[PDB]
Each structure stands twice: as C-alpha cells, then as structure tokens.
Amino acid sequence: FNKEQQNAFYEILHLPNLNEEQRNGFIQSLKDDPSQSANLLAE
Amino acid sequence: FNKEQQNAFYEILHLPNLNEEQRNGFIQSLKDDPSQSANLLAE
Amino acid sequence: PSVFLFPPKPKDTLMISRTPEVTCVVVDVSHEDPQVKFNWYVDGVQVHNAKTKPREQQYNSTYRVVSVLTVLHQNWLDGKEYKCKVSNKALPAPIEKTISKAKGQPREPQVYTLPPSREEMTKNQVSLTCLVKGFYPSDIAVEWESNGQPENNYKTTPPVLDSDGSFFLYSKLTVDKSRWQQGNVFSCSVMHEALHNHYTQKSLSL
Amino acid sequence: PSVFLFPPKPKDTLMISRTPEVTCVVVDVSHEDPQVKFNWYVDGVQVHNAKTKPREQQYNSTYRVVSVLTVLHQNWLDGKEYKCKVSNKALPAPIEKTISKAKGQPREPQVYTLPPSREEMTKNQVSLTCLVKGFYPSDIAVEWESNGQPENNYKTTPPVLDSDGSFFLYSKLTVDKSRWQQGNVFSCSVMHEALHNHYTQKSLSL
Numbered sequence: 001f002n003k004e005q006q007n008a009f010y011e012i013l014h015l016p017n018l019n020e021e022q023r024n025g026f027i028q029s030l031k032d033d034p035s036q037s038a039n040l041l042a043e
Numbered sequence: 044f045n046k047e048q049q050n051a052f053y054e055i056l057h058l059p060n061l062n063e064e065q066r067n068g069f070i071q072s073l074k075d076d077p078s079q080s081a082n083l084l085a086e
Numbered sequence: 087p088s089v090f091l092f093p094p095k096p097k098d099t100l101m102i103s104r105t106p107e108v109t110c111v112v113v114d115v116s117h118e119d120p121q122v123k124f125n126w127y128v129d130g131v132q133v134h135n136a137k138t139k140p141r142e143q144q145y146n147s148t149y150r151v152v153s154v155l156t157v158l159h160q161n162w163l164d165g166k167e168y169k170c171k172v173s174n175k176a177l178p179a180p181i182e183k184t185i186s187k188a189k190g191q192p193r194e195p196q197v198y199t200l201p202p203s204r205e206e207m208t209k210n211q212v213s214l215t216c217l218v219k220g221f222y223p224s225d226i227a228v229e230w231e232s233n234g235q236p237e238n239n240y241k242t243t244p245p246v247l248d249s250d251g252s253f254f255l256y257s258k259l260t261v262d263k264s265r266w267q268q269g270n271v272f273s274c275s276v277m278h279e280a281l282h283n284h285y286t287q288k289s290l291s292l
Numbered sequence: 293p294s295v296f297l298f299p300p301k302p303k304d305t306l307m308i309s310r311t312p313e314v315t316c317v318v319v320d321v322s323h324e325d326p327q328v329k330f331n332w333y334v335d336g337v338q339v340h341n342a343k344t345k346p347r348e349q350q351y352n353s354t355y356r357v358v359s360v361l362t363v364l365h366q367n368w369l370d371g372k373e374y375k376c377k378v379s380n381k382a383l384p385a386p387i388e389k390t391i392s393k394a395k396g397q398p399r400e401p402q403v404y405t406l407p408p409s410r411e412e413m414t415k416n417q418v419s420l421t422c423l424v425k426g427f428y429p430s431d432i433a434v435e436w437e438s439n440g441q442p443e444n445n446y447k448t449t450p451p452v453l454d455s456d457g458s459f460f461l462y463s464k465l466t467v468d469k470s471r472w473q474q475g476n477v478f479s480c481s482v483m484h485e486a487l488h489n490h491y492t493q494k495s496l497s498l
C-alpha cells in the first residue's frame with residue numbers, strides 16, 4: 001500500500017463490464033507503471 | 044463446580060506442610076464424601 | 087501404527103467435581119497383530135490399569151485403539167509425567183510418549199470485561215468481550231453467564247502467546263441490543279490454576 | 293514423498309503493490325530419484341513456468357524441494373484453482389493438490405475499537421483492543437499504528453468462526469498507561485477483500 005495505484009487497481013478489478021482480458025491488461029500496466037496509475041476505464 | 048468441596052479441595056491442595064500422602068488422603072476422602080467436605084487440615 | 091497422547095481437559099483437572107483423563111490414541115495396530123499392550127507410567131512408576139480403559143474401534147481399513155488413564159488432579163497440577171507405551175510384535179520398538187503440563191511457574195490471569203462500542207449500538211445485536219491476559223500456562227477455561235445462568239452464545243479464542251511470555255485470550259458474547267440496553271447483568275467466569283479457588287468471575291452490566 | 297500446497301498471504305493478494313505466491317512444498321523426493329517434475333495448472337490450463345521457481349534444499353537425511361508459483365491478484369480473488377502436481381519415478385502416481393480461496397460470497401468486516409478497562413488503569417501498561425467481526429472469508433489482515441506510524445507491539449488472534457457463519461478476531465495493542473493517558477491517537481488498520489479499497493482504518497483516542 002501507497003498510491004492510488006491500488007485505488008485504481010480496486011476499481012479496475014470491480015469493473016462489471018471490463019471483460020477479462022480487458023481487465024487483466026489494465027491491471028498489469030498498472031503494476032508496470034505506477035505513474036500512469038490513473039489511466040483507468042473502457043466501458 | 045458447586046460446593047465447598049472444591050474450596051476444601053483447593054486448600055488441602057495448597058497445604059505447604061501437608062506431606063504427599065497426608066494430602067492425597069484428604070483430597071480423596073473429599074471426592075468420596077462431599078458432605079464431610081469441611082474435614083480439612085493436619086499441620 | 088502411530089501413538090498420540092492427549093492431556094486432560096483443563097476444566098477437568100481444575101474441578102474436583104470433575105475427572106481428568108490422559109487419552110492415548112493410536113491409529114493402526116493392524117490385523118494379525120492387534121495385540122497392543124498399553125503401558126502406563128506415572129512419573130517413574132507403572133500403574134497397571136490405574137483404571138486404564140482401552141475400548142476397541144473398527145475403522146478405515148484398520149483399527150483405532152484408545153486407552154484412557156485417569157489422573158489425580160493433584161498429580162497433573164504438580165506435573166507428573168504421563169508416559170504411554172504401545173507394544174505389539176509387528177512393531178519393532180515400544181512407541182513411547184510423555185506428557186505433563188507446561189512447566190514454568192503459574193501466572194494469574196487478568197480478567198477485564200469490555201462493553202460494546204457505541205458504533206455497535208447501531209447494530210441490533212451487540213458484542214460483549216472478555217479479555218483474559220497474562221496467564222500461564224495456557225491451560226485455562228472461560229465461560230459466560232446471563233443474570234446468573236449459562237449463556238451458550240459465546241465464542242472463545244485460543245490462548246495466544248503475548249510479548250510478555252504470557253498467554254492471552256478474548257471471549258465474545260453476542261447478545262441482543264435490547265438485552266443489553268435493559269441493563270441486564272452479564273458475566274465472564276474464568277477458571278485457571280492460578281485463580282483464587284481455581285475460579286473467578288467478572289461482570290458486565292449496563 | 294508428501295506434497296503440501298500453501299496459499300498466498302492475504303495481504304499479498306490484496307495489495308497490488310505486493311506479489312502473491314502459491315508455494316508447493318514437498319518433503320522427501322529421495323536420492324537416485326530426485327527428478328520431481330513440478331506441474332502447475334491454473335483453472336484448467338498448464339502454466340509452464342508462469343514464473344515457477346523450485347529452489348533445492350538438502351535436509352534431514354532427505355531432500356526438501358519447493359516451487360513457488362506467482363499468482364495474479366485478480367485470479368485468486370476470483371478464485372481459480374491452483375493445482376500442483378509432483379511427478380518422479382520412485383512415485384507410482386502424480387501427487388495432485390488443489391487450492392483456491394474459500395468460496396462463499398464475501399462479507400465485510402466490522403471494525404470497532406475498544407479502550408482499556410478502568411480496572412486496567414490500575415496497571416501501568418494498558419491494552420487496546422480491536423474487534424473485527426462478521427467477515428468472510430477468513431483471509432484478513434489487521435495492523436496497528438501510533439499517531440500515524442507503525443506499532444510493532446501487537447498480537448492478533450486467529451480468525452475463529454462465529455455462530456453467524458462469519459469469522460471474527462481480536463487484536464491487542466499493549467501500550468504504556470502514560471502513553472494512553474496523554475490522549476495519544478492509536479488506530480487499527482484492517483485489510484480484507486470486502487473493504488472499501490481492500491483497506492479500512494479505525495481510531496482509538498483518549
């Protein structure tokens with residue numbers, strides 16, 4: 001814990017319509033660049 | 044629990060000078076007749 | 087085969103009204119060799135029976151054999167060694183097992199009773215907490231009562247070792263918000279060796 | 293040989309800043325047959341490595357071999373099956389082991405913070421209590437802070453299942469009587485899946 005990296009992680013994890021790969025992608029880019037950690041949401 | 048059977052048990056158990064057999068006797072008679080449970084102490 | 091050896095229940099060694107038992111549970115033994123001669127020793131001495139009572143069970147694909155040595159309250163509290171030994175012939179060596187209590191020097195438990203939080207009176211069931219701390223050995227028994235009579239509605243946590251080198255626990259009585267608010271008396275009743283008559287009790291009232 | 297399979301630490305599956313690992317600990321394997329081909333499956337699919345990392349240990353009189361599959365937070369929280377399989381030739385059958393989490397439907401924990409008892413202010417160390425109740429699954433992580441910074445002085449009880457079909461725990465912060473009396477802020481910080489951002493915090497202040 002620290003950042004909104006996780007706040008962002010949480011959301012993208014609980015995205016109802018963010019289908020599978022669509023989610024996995026967002027979560028992983030979000031491990032890779034916490035900076036970018038704010039980049040969330042498709043549907 | 045119930046009675047002074049145990050209150051009596053406690054004491055006779057914590058008798059400093061009530062040597063071994065001297066104690067064991069008192070404790071066992073005290074299981075056998077809770078009625079008599081009040082009969083405690085030598086030394 | 088494998089020989090486990092269990093202690094008497096702490097309540098049962100504490101209360102003279104109770105009877106403490108040291109249970110030697112072996113699971114295996116086998117057929118063609120069921121002849122497991124239990125051997126019971128107390129401190130040094132063999133106790134013959136000493137009211138040892140093995141009762142045969144027929145399980146799994148194998149046998150589950152248990153002998154229960156009954157203990158003098160005094161002896162276990164004074165920590166003798168309860169040595170169980172299982173014989174046979176399919177078994178090259180006498181499977182030996184020693185129990186006794188802790189060994190430390192008793193420490194008297196601290197029993198404080200804790201009311202529900204105000205944030206929890208927003209629930210219509212509340213929780214009553216008893217903190218029992220700084221005891222030794224881990225061998226304790228807590229129970230709850232309502233007004234003067236048994237409450238079956240409690241959950242006790244396992245003794246867990248504190249920084250102190252003591253043990254502690256919590257016990258949580260869940261009552262109805264109303265049942266608390268009506269200024270009804272609750273109480274936690276703790277039993278441990280280092281207590282006044284192996285017994286104490288502490289009250290929670292609104 | 294015998295193959296145990298452990299979960300990721302709940303904190304480590306909860307926090308995206310952390311990395312969850314499923315550890316397959318086998319103790320035996322033997323010499324002349326060390327060739328234990330670990331097989332890692334996730335839901336149905338084999339993961340090859342999926343960054344599987346067995347590191348050899350040389351113990352007892354035998355070998356202690358462990359492979360650590362790293363897990364996606366998401367997958368375990370969505371409960372996939374983490375199936376470990378150990379091969380060999382001294383071993384007639386592939387030793388299979390499945391883990392995943394609980395399976396129930398998450399329940400959000402109730403975090404109330406409880407002050408020391410007045411009878412405990414007669415001690416010059418007091419205790420701070422956090423009750424965390426009615427969660428599911430048992431996979432939780434509580435911690436304490438002082439003013440805003442880590443307190444290392446705490447003991448947490450294991451989650452124990454309540455009447456509810458929920459889990460509960462207590463966590464006990466022992467501070468100095470003075471340290472409490474000076475109106476200093478304390479806080480318990482609970483981490484569980486069913487919390488706002490997998491994280492919450494509740495404060496104890498005089």
Ligand SMILES: *[C@@H]1O[C@H](CO[C@H]2O[C@H](C)[C@@H](O)[C@@H](O)[C@@H]2O)[C@@H](O[C@@H]2O[C@H](CO)[C@@H](O[C@@H]3O[C@H](CO[C@H]4O[C@H](CO)[C@@H](O)[C@H](O)[C@@H]4O[C@@H]4O[C@H](CO)[C@@H](O[C@@H]5O[C@H](CO)[C@H](O)[C@H](O)[C@H]5O)[C@H](O)[C@H]4NC(C)=O)[C@@H](O)[C@H](O[C@H]4O[C@H](CO)[C@@H](O)[C@H](O)[C@@H]4O[C@@H]4O[C@H](CO)[C@@H](O)[C@H](O)[C@H]4NC(C)=O)[C@@H]3O)[C@H](O)[C@H]2NC(C)=O)[C@H](O)[C@H]1NC(C)=O
Pocket residue numbers: 090092093094095098105106107108109111113145146147148150
């Ligand atoms: C063939 O089948 C049988 C039976 O199988 C069942 O299931 C089948 C599917 C079915 O078909 C049937 O066959 C049958 O229904 C298999 O038997 C099982 O065998 C295993 C071992 O292989 C045993 O496991 C051990 O269990 C110990 C704990 O035992 C208690 O709990 C279990 C679970 O509830 C109970 O089953 C058991 O009966 C015990 O309950 C306690 O019993 C005593 C005596 O009755 C109670 O006494 C009280 O006494 C007072 C006296 O005043 C008073 O009278 C009370 O009223 C009495 O109740 C006591 O209260 C009970 N407890 C409770 C809570 O009620 C484990 O401790 C043991 O684990 C230790 O050893 C293993 C092996 O080395 C370690 O791996 C393990 O880590 C641990 O080691 C160390 O132990 C220390 C002590 O615990 C510990 O402090 C230390 O930390 C620890 N070390 C580490 C590193 O952790 C082990 O798990 C099963 O118990 C047994 N099942 C039964 C039903 O008996 C058989 O194997 C199978 N054959 C095969 C498969 O080939």
Ligand SMILES: *[C@@H]1O[C@H](CO[C@H]2O[C@H](C)[C@@H](O)[C@@H](O)[C@@H]2O)[C@@H](O[C@@H]2O[C@H](CO)[C@@H](O[C@@H]3O[C@H](CO[C@H]4O[C@H](CO)[C@@H](O)[C@H](O)[C@@H]4O[C@@H]4O[C@H](CO)[C@@H](O[C@@H]5O[C@H](CO)[C@H](O)[C@H](O)[C@H]5O)[C@H](O)[C@H]4NC(C)=O)[C@@H](O)[C@H](O[C@H]4O[C@H](CO)[C@@H](O)[C@H](O)[C@@H]4O[C@@H]4O[C@H](CO)[C@@H](O)[C@H](O)[C@H]4NC(C)=O)[C@@H]3O)[C@H](O)[C@H]2NC(C)=O)[C@H](O)[C@H]1NC(C)=O
Pocket residue numbers: 296298299300301304311312313314315317319351352353354356
């Ligand atoms: C030859 O020697 C070796 C080693 O021996 C030592 O001692 C010698 C004297 C010395 O000379 C040396 O050889 C050496 O120092 C012997 O190996 C031992 O073998 C036994 C089995 O025979 C194993 O016992 C089992 O242990 C399980 C628990 O294991 C954890 O705890 C132990 C004790 O602390 C640790 O040793 C062990 O390493 C485990 O720690 C956990 O490890 C994981 C993985 O690293 C940690 O993972 C975290 O992962 C996250 C990921 O994000 C993160 O990265 C973290 O940082 C990581 O840490 C995890 O955190 C660790 N945990 C902690 C608290 O730190 C027991 O569960 C197991 O018991 C089950 O099975 C037996 C057998 O069936 C049952 O009898 C028993 O009842 C129980 O059954 C059921 O299990 C369920 C799951 O637990 C349970 O829910 C259920 O209730 C239960 N059923 C019942 C009825 O109760 C068993 O006790 C030893 O672990 C192993 N020792 C070592 C050091 O590895 C070898 O046997 C010997 N050969 C011989 C004698 O022939």
